[PDB]
Amino acid sequence: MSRIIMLIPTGTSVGLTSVSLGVIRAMERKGVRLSVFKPIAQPAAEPLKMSYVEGLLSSNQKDVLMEEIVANYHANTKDAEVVLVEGLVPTRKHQFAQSLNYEIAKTLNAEIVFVMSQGTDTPEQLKERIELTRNSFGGAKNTNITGVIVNRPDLSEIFDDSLQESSPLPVLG
Numbered sequence: 001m002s003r004i005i006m007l008i009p010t011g012t013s014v015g016l017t018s019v020s021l022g023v024i025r026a027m028e029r030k031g032v033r034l035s036v037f038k039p040i041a042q043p044a045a046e047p048l049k050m051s052y053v054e055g056l057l058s059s060n061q062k063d064v065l066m067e068e069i070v071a072n073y074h075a076n077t078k079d080a081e082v083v084l085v086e087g088l089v090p091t092r093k094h095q096f097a098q099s100l101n102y103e104i105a106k107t108l109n110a111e112i113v114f115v116m117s118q119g120t121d122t123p124e125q126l127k128e129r130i131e132l133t134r135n136s137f138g139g140a141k142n143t144n145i146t147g148v149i150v151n152r153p154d155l156s157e158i159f160d161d162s163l164q165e166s167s168p169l170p171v172l173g
Ligand SMILES: [Zn+2]
Pocket: 028, 029
């Protein structure tokens, strides 16, 4: 209602749950009504099963899929003031994962926040992946790209955990 933020988890273990848990706690302390919406499960409405999503995509019913996601979004965010949307991890088996992430963010008019893990990267290698990730969601054109997490309420209030100088995106938390 007041702020829709979609977390794009760009890694098989980037601590997406830790980020969401921190947002739940920050909002509860401020009395802000928060809904965490996970449109699709990653193997008033549960996350859609991946096999159901694949069946709708297989049968050329992507429109039906998006309608169901939008309907579930509304059933799950009634009277929410902040909505945190949990996106899909791009895994080996699913070539539709990142296109579905973009389509969901676009349809929900969500601000996009990428959740990364440093892993083995050097600082500059991580920043290269951050810039690559931003360009793949529209780059400088897409005004909804909001920031990156590496591990109307202000983002500092939403992502309070309490490379930010040279990062391609503002680093949150
Ligand atoms: Zn409390």
